[PDB]
Write an enzyme that holds these catalytic residues in place. Structure first.
Site, PDB file in Angstrom:
ATOM      1  N   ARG A 524     -16.034  14.792 -18.795  1.00  0.00           N
ATOM      2  CA  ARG A 524     -16.144  16.244 -18.859  1.00  0.00           C
ATOM      3  C   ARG A 524     -16.318  16.730 -20.305  1.00  0.00           C
ATOM      4  NH1 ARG A 524     -12.985  19.075 -14.209  1.00  0.00           N
ATOM      5  NH2 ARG A 524     -12.235  17.216 -13.133  1.00  0.00           N
ATOM      6  N   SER A 588     -10.504   7.495 -23.494  1.00  0.00           N
ATOM      7  CA  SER A 588      -9.284   6.753 -22.988  1.00  0.00           C
ATOM      8  C   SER A 588      -9.382   5.273 -23.005  1.00  0.00           C
ATOM      9  CB  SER A 588      -8.995   7.429 -21.638  1.00  0.00           C
ATOM     10  OG  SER A 588     -10.156   7.346 -20.809  1.00  0.00           O
ATOM     11  N   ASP A 642      -6.001   9.636 -23.578  1.00  0.00           N
ATOM     12  CA  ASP A 642      -5.642  10.592 -22.519  1.00  0.00           C
ATOM     13  C   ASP A 642      -4.142  10.669 -22.263  1.00  0.00           C
ATOM     14  OD1 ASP A 642      -6.531   8.528 -19.602  1.00  0.00           O
ATOM     15  OD2 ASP A 642      -5.890   7.854 -21.524  1.00  0.00           O
TER      16      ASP A 642
HETATM   17  O1  LIG Z   1      -8.758   8.001 -14.021  1.00  0.00           O
HETATM   18  P1  LIG Z   1      -8.418   9.288 -13.429  1.00  0.00           P
HETATM   19  O2  LIG Z   1      -8.052   9.215 -11.989  1.00  0.00           O
HETATM   20  O3  LIG Z   1      -9.537  10.224 -13.465  1.00  0.00           O
HETATM   21  O4  LIG Z   1      -7.108   9.858 -14.189  1.00  0.00           O
HETATM   22  C1  LIG Z   1      -7.024   9.958 -15.604  1.00  0.00           C
HETATM   23  C2  LIG Z   1      -7.614  11.236 -16.161  1.00  0.00           C
HETATM   24  O5  LIG Z   1      -6.986  12.376 -15.547  1.00  0.00           O
HETATM   25  C3  LIG Z   1      -7.591  13.622 -15.950  1.00  0.00           C
HETATM   26  O6  LIG Z   1      -6.778  14.658 -15.178  1.00  0.00           O
HETATM   27  C4  LIG Z   1      -7.413  13.797 -17.454  1.00  0.00           C
HETATM   28  O7  LIG Z   1      -7.877  15.103 -17.814  1.00  0.00           O
HETATM   29  C5  LIG Z   1      -8.123  12.655 -18.133  1.00  0.00           C
HETATM   30  O8  LIG Z   1      -8.059  12.682 -19.540  1.00  0.00           O
HETATM   31  C6  LIG Z   1      -7.447  11.327 -17.673  1.00  0.00           C
HETATM   32  O9  LIG Z   1      -8.132  10.215 -18.232  1.00  0.00           O
HETATM   33  O1  LIG Z   2      -7.043   6.191 -18.583  1.00  0.00           O
HETATM   34  C1  LIG Z   2      -5.790   5.438 -18.626  1.00  0.00           C
HETATM   35  C2  LIG Z   2      -5.766   4.241 -19.532  1.00  0.00           C
HETATM   36  O2  LIG Z   2      -6.735   3.272 -19.079  1.00  0.00           O
HETATM   37  C3  LIG Z   2      -6.653   2.041 -19.781  1.00  0.00           C
HETATM   38  O3  LIG Z   2      -5.429   1.449 -19.608  1.00  0.00           O
HETATM   39  C4  LIG Z   2      -7.088   2.348 -21.245  1.00  0.00           C
HETATM   40  O4  LIG Z   2      -7.056   1.126 -21.958  1.00  0.00           O
HETATM   41  C5  LIG Z   2      -6.089   3.334 -21.842  1.00  0.00           C
HETATM   42  O5  LIG Z   2      -6.476   3.635 -23.179  1.00  0.00           O
HETATM   43  C6  LIG Z   2      -6.045   4.602 -21.012  1.00  0.00           C
HETATM   44  O6  LIG Z   2      -4.952   5.437 -21.372  1.00  0.00           O
END
Ligand SMILES: O=P(O)(O)OC[C@H]1O[C@@H](O)[C@H](O)[C@@H](O)[C@@H]1O
Ligand SMILES: OC[C@H]1O[C@H](O)[C@H](O)[C@@H](O)[C@@H]1O
Ligand SMILES: Nc1ncnc2c1ncn2[C@@H]1O[C@H](COP(=O)(O)OP(=O)(O)O)[C@@H](O)[C@H]1O
Ligand SMILES: O=P(O)(O)OC[C@H]1O[C@@H](O)[C@H](O)[C@@H](O)[C@@H]1O
Ligand SMILES: OC[C@H]1O[C@H](O)[C@H](O)[C@@H](O)[C@@H]1O
EC number: 2.7.1.1
Length: 898
Positions: A524, A588, A642
């Protein structure tokens, strides 16, 4: 004509007309519905007990079994082989064991010690003590059963009355008695009523058999009911045998207009007064005593033996049902009456013999009539369930009275067929006894116990005890110390990376900021406006942009060009023009930062693999892509994980928020550490948010004692084999694959889907976070789980769906406990470090699995509470995503330039 006519008048209340028998039949139809009803079952006299026998035999049974048979006239032990050899359905051997009245009327222990001793003798004699023959138990008393191998005695009936058995699981009592012997092992896998063994014995020969009827010492019937009518058994699926326990019909007083003074007298002096009242007007234990009572009254009135009354005549039990049977024989009956009565101490006349034979007739015919009425109600019930005009069914029958009386079965059949004219009913005598049928139940129970045993052994590898979880917690803590210390930081698997964020929001931040959110499910671009003062506000806008897997795994130039193209789009979408704006980049992945705005990518994780990125500063990569487009300019002020943006998003309102946690595609955490503990960054003043990169915990072999065969498979087939092991036991990209691998193994072992490993089941990624969460939802009955499994592409049944739901639950529960242990380590470190007796701390959390799973967050919070009891942790789910916190970080970064 005279005598019999007068006897007919004397015992007129015992001569039941068809109108009365139809009335009784209708009463019994009502009782059956009361016993099956969840509302009236607690106060129903006809208990309609579930048996957990869901089908008559189908021919696949095979094996070598032991069957015990207790509660009828004889205690038997049988060895039953079924299709154990070609051209021999069944082969049986048997032994009757004398079981005197002192054992049947004594203590429970003494009764079960007797059974265990006779069983030992039986196995001893045949040298089968080491064959491991599964044992089936025919126990002919009302039992509460929640599974085939449990039988909680509700009430003793008939001749038995051993203390300490009502309310106890007789399988456990029997196991107890056997263990006490120490002589042999016995695997008791199934307990059935004798009605049920009879129906199974007869169902092995006749596939239309749907009823088992006993008319012996006591009387009872079982029949195949539809699951949708059995309120106390979950499921609407198929059929299940119901043990009516019809002997208790009338125990509430509803048959008092049928019962006579003789019935009241036999009931008052029995072992169980007031109970089994219908049974006492019908079965072999009672008919001869009813006749004796009638003769005694008649004698007293001078109607028999010229008023002669002997003490033998007055002795309860002195005239049995065998005498009634001998007396009703066609040619010898009167002669037999003479001999029998002569032995009573009387000197019966010939007319006395005729009269006595007629009293036997009326008593035994009333019994046959009564059982025809209740069996007629079960047949109308089956007809209603099948939904046809006519009923075709076979009733399997056993019991001494039915088998040996010279007229009863003929009269019973004829009345039965007259009462249910719409049925074509076949009566099959069970000549082999309950044992054969009990063995068929035992064969199926043993096959299912074996499949359960192996499933449980597989699933037990995912169970983590509290001590094991405390050990995972301890290991996480030790790895946290390794990564923070200079000496050990370089070979530490949990990197404990400095984020250069040194404080939570102080309330002064304000400005307009752009942000990027890359690495989760959605890439995003955001615009965040923060205003402080009187009434602080945060206004956010965003657009999601897809990132095809070819760009996620193509070149770094392609990936950053793509990110820059999306930013260009978003600036047009928002109408952003004017001087270059400050930007915070949520990226992330693990980065080694030398400041807030510089982060070198250490390694790719999750599904990213773009080339020429690892070992490069990703801010430089982004700044290079902005220069290549040569359109907008941006001021990249910060690169953030993140976790860290999630923590700051939560800490905007909560002063206690000092921890961030992600459970989404990947899993990771961050927390505010003291600068004195952050040895890799110069300075001992204040704090610094540490991005743990805890996903790699276990990459040095520290979790090998809890990783399963299935975890090893998921890692071996992954994009980064050997890395991010802890994350692979927790997060959304990986739980579905653990489940998929368990389901494949179970399907190959024949426990699921008919042994068919479909091509859908062999496709990676099918148990996505959405679907795993849907399958475990509490408020989703069977139909919806199957709906989901079928819709994915799997041929699932109700039993299939239940096993699928269990497997999902074992995996998600272990992921939430493992995440909990790692979080317990982090909060106790913060507590212990600040020298506090209790810590009140908030964790900002986000991630799709965390948000959507029905049980993960609850299990995880429970685990943290149990493993770090001096911490009181509050987990607050981000509403806004990492954005508000990335912008807060960006504000302070601009601020810190000045
Ligand atoms: O991997 P996801 O399920 O999308 O969850 C992780 C993500 O959550 C979103 O709500 C955050 O704004 C992101 O920064 C985070 O990386
Ligand atoms: O998105 C959640 C996590 O995914 C993985 O573990 C990445 O290595 C880490 O940097 C991030 O915080
Ligand atoms: N509803 C009834 N209840 C009790 N006794 C009955 C009843 N109906 C008939 N009986 C008696 O049963 C006998 C008739 O037996 P039944 O089976 O019909 O013929 P059979 O003489 O061949 O045995 C007679 O003694 C008759 O009085
Ligand atoms: O009470 P009875 O007269 O012995 O009749 C009933 C008995 O019949 C035997 O053939 C069955 O094997 C027993 O399981 C049953 O309890
Ligand atoms: O043995 C025949 C029947 O006798 C009694 O009525 C028992 O309560 C019942 O469980 C059994 O089936």
């Amino acid at each position: 004509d005279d005598q019999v006519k007068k006897i007919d008048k004397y015992l007129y209340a015992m001569r039941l007309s068809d109108e009365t028998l139809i009335d009784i039949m209708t009463r019994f139809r009502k009782e059956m519905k009361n016993g099956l009803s969840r509302d009236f079952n607690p106060t129903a006299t006809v208990k309609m007990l579930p048996t957990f026998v869901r089908s008559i035999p189908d021919g696949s049974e095979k094996g070598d079994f032991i069957a015990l048979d207790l509660g009828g006239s004889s205690f038997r032990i049988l060895r039953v082989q079924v299709n154990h050899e070609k051209n021999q359905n069944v082969h049986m051997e048997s032994e009757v064991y004398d079981t005197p009245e002192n054992i049947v009327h004594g203590s429970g222990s003494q009764l079960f010690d007797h059974v265990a001793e006779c069983l030992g003798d039986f196995m001893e004699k045949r040298k089968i003590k080491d064959k491991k023959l599964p044992v089936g138990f025919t126990f002919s008393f009302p039992c509460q059963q929640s599974k085939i191998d449990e039988a909680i005695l509700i009430t003793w009936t008939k001749r038995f009355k051993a203390s300490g058995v009502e309310g106890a699981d007789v399988v456990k009592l029997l196991n107890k008695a056997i263990k006490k012997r120490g002589d042999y092992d016995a695997n008791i896998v199934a307990v059935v009523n004798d009605t049920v063994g009879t129906m199974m014995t007869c169902g092995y020969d006749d596939q239309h058999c749907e009823v088992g009827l006993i008319i012996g010492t006591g009387t009872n019937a079982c029949y195949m009911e539809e699951l949708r009518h059995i309120d106390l058994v979950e499921g609407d699926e198929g059929r299940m045998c119901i043990n009516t326990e019809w002997g208790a019909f009338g125990d509430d007083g509803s048959l008092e207009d049928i019962r006579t003074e003789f019935d009241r007298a036999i009931d008052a002096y029995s072992l169980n007064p007031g109970k089994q009242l219908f049974e006492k007007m019908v079965s072999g234990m009672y008919l001869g005593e009813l006749v004796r009572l009638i003769l005694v009254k008649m004698a007293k009135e001078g109607l028999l033996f010229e008023g002669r009354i002997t003490p033998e005549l007055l002795t309860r039990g002195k005239f049995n049902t065998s005498d009634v049977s001998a007396i009703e024989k066609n040619k010898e009956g009167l002669h037999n009456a003479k001999e029998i009565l002569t032995r009573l101490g009387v000197e019966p006349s010939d007319d006395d013999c005729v009269s006595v034979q007629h009293v036997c007739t009326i008593v035994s015919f009333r019994s046959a009539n009564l059982v025809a009425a209740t069996l007629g109600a079960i047949l109308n019930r089956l007809r209603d369930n099948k939904g046809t005009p006519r009923l075709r069914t076979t009733v399997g029958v056993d019991g001494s009275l039915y088998k040996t009386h010279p007229q009863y079965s003929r009269r019973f059949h004829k009345t039965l067929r007259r009462l249910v004219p719409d049925s074509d009913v076949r009566f099959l005598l069970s000549e082999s006894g309950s044992g054969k049928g009990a063995a068929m139940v035992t064969a199926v129970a043993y096959r299912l116990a074996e499949q359960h045993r192996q499933i449980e052994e597989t699933l037990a590898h995912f169970h983590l005890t509290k001590d094991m979880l405390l050990e995972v917690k301890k290991r996480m803590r030790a790895e946290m110390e390794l990564g923070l210390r200079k000496q050990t930081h370089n070979n530490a698997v949990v990197k404990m990376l400095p984020s250069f964020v040194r404080r939570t929001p102080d309330g002064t931040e304000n400005g307009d900021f752009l942000a990027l959110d890359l690495g989760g499910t959605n890439f995003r671009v955001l615009l965040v406006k923060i205003r402080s003062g009187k009434k602080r506000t945060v206004e956010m806008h965003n657009k999601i942009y897809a990132i095809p897997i070819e760009i996620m795994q193509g070149t770094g130039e392609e990936l950053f060009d793509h990110i820059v193209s999306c930013i260009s789009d978003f600036l047009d979408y928002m109408g952003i023009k004017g001087p270059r704006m400050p930007l915070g980049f949520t990226f992330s992945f693990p980065c080694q930062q030398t400041s807030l705005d510089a982060g070198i990518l250490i390694t790719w994780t999750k599904g990213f693999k773009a080339t020429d990125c690892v070992g490069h500063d990703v801010v430089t990569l982004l700044r290079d892509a902005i220069k290549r487009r040569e359109e907008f300019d941006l001021d990249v002020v910060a690169v953030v994980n993140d976790t860290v943006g999630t923590m700051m998003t939560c800490a905007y309102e909560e002063p206690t928020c000092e921890v961030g946690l992600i459970v989404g595609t990947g899993s990771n955490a961050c927390y505010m550490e003291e600068m004195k503990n952050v040895e890799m960054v110069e300075g001992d003043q204040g704090q610094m948010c540490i991005n743990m990169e805890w996903g790699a915990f276990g990459d040095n072999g520290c979790l090998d004692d809890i990783r399963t065969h299935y975890d090893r498979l998921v890692d071996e087939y992954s994009l980064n084999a050997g890395k991010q092991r802890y994350e692979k036991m927790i997060s959304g990209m990986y739980l579905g694959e653990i489940v998929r691998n368990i389901l494949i193994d179970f399907t190959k072992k024949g426990f699921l889907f008919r042994g068919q490993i479909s091509e859908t089941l062999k496709t990676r990624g099918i148990f996505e976070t959405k679907f795993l969460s849907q399958i475990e939802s509490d408020r989703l009955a069977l139909l919806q789980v199957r709906a989901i499994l079928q819709q994915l592409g799997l041929n699932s049944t109700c039993d299939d769906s239940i096993l699928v739901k269990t497997v999902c639950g074992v995996v998600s529960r272990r992921a939430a406990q493992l995440c909990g242990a790692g979080m317990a380590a982090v909060v106790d470190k913060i507590r212990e470090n600040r020298g506090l007796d209790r810590l009140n701390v908030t964790v900002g959390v986000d991630g799709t699995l965390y948000k959507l799973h029905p049980h993960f967050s609850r299990i995880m919070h429970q685990t943290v509470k149990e493993l770090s009891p001096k911490c009181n942790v509050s987990f607050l789910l981000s509403e806004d995503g990492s954005g508000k916190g990335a912008a807060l970080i960006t504000a302070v970064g601009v601020r810190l330039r000045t």
